[PDB]
């Protein structure tokens, strides 16, 4: 009857951090994909399943809308088979990805004079995440032989680090809101 919530994800005044990335399951509705593909405000629109113009003529069992904020230098890693801090420890796209990622520069919103320290990426982890694994744990990371004993110090680091978004930043270091639609037949146009 009514459209699937593609205004709740693409127009929220407040996204999440890449380590604690949101995920909204979309089901049993009708999707107007024409609000995305013809918006002329996205820096990235790269699709890995079926064509974006040919999107609202395919029905899917289920849709997920992962949304977070990263640097513009790291949108490179929101893609199957990519590597890096974001891909290894924050958000991993399966190499059989069907769906597509949408990123648009948000320096006007997520950057603050004197830094915006509300967005965090996980910097320290022992192993890479599984595809679509989430990790919101904040235990102290033992970078040495000595046990940490729950005391942040030398060779024992708090695992999350803060993007210091600043409106003076270079375009690679400015904030980029990202939406990652995944498809897997209750939803179509």
């Amino acid at each position, epitope marked *: 009857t009514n459209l699937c919530p593609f205004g709740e994800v693409f127009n929220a005044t407040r996204f999440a951090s890449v380590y604690a990335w949101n995920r909204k399951r979309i089901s049993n509705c009708v999707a107007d994909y024409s609000v995305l593909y013809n918006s002329a405000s996205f820096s990235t629109f790269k699709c890995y399943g079926v064509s974006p113009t040919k999107l609202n003529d395919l029905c899917f069992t289920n849709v997920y809308a992962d949304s977070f904020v990263i640097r513009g230098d790291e949108v490179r890693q929101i893609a199957p088979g990519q590597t*890096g801090k974001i891909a290894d420890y924050n958000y991993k796209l399966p190499d059989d990805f069907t769906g597509c990622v949408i990123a648009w520069n948000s320096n006007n919103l997520d950057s603050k004079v004197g830094g915006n320290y509300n967005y965090l990426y996980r910097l320290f982890r*022992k192993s*890479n995440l599984k595809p679509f694994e989430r990790d919101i744990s904040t235990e102290i990371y033992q970078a040495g032989s000595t046990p940490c004993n729950g005391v942040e110090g030398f060779n024992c*680091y708090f695992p999350l680090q803060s993007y210091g978004f600043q409106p003076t930043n270079g375009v690679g270091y400015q904030p980029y809101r990202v939406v990652v639609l995944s498809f897997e037949a209750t939803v179509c146009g």
Partner: antibody
Amino acid sequence: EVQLVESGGGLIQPGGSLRLSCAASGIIVSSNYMTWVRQAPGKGLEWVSVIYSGGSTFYADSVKGRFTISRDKSKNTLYLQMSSLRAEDTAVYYCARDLGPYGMDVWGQGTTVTVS
Amino acid sequence: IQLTQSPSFLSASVGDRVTITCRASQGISSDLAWYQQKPGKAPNLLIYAASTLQSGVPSRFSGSGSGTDFTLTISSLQPEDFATYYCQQLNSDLYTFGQGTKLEIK
């Protein structure tokens, strides 16, 4: 307490190969961003390779397709497998430990690699 | 990001107040670190996050700046404090160093 010791450099002919070692006491190699940084005689520092804790590796464009970085979790050691060494690889290499927002705090003493 | 330091060669007397600047092409906003390297030795980290002193470094080293211009200030020069000083872009994937200022005790 916290130390990196490097060994294995020497004289080597162009095109040949050589492996460098980095023995870490205190620091777990298999849990850290371990880098290799080189400094030519009379020139500045230059990042060469980095291996993440999870297993990802990355290389400088002046080095890609020749050098390979690797670690032995049992001995707590780091390797940089050099290959096809040109005359521009004559530099002193340091294995650092990188922390991201925190700098490269610990460093090895350096191994000098000659080409002739 | 092409990091440029200035000056490249410097001379000052002991006790002089020395200011070293590293200039960032586009703007990194805190992501700079300062290293010291004695002749024939290993680099020593001095100031990470462009203002925070690494533990063990004397409190006569101060870092300042944010974005495009950063500064390494030695509030009182010392006769052992001659070395080459490097800036590095932290949280980057090229690990961009500077060319390096060879500070010299006059």
